[PDB]
RNA sequence: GUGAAACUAAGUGGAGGUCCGAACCGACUGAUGUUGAAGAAUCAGCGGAUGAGUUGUGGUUAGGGGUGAAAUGCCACUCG
């Protein structure tokens, strides 16, 4: 498939709600944790990324994903 | 607010052997009375007052016993 940032993004999305399903059960599986983080922090500098290259592909990303917007 | 929680601000809600305070149930202090109006009361304040609450009617437990949030206290002004 492609790589484009959205795509990242989408694929992050299903890899991040997958794990937080298994943390309910197996909450005690700290070492998934940490790379739960990742993750999330990887889209999150790729978002970062996004929104000053263009607001218009941000707005329209985080409003079809349901992903909060930060502030400041 | 967070990945989800923990946490956190308002509003709604009206909990409590909760608060003040009448009835009601109690009886802490003092005065008066003390051949008393009264064989424990009057007067002025005092405690609890949605609770382990108060009360009526109809019943139960009887003495080498009964009952007792237990004083040897109560059991028809009578109770080691
Ligand atoms: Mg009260
Ligand atoms: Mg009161
Ligand atoms: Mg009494
Ligand atoms: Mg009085
Ligand atoms: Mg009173
Ligand atoms: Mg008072
Ligand atoms: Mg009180
Ligand atoms: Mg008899
Ligand atoms: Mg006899
Ligand atoms: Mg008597």
Known sequence: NKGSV??????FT???????????????????????????????????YLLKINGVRYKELISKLNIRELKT
Request: net charge positive.
């Open 6 to 11: 959205e795509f990242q993004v989408f694929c």
């Open 14 to 48: 299903n890899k991040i709600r997958r794990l937080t399903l298994h943390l309910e059960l197996h909450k005690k599986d700290y070492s998934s944790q940490r790379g739960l983080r990742k993750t999330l922090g990887k889209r999150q500098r790729l978002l970062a």
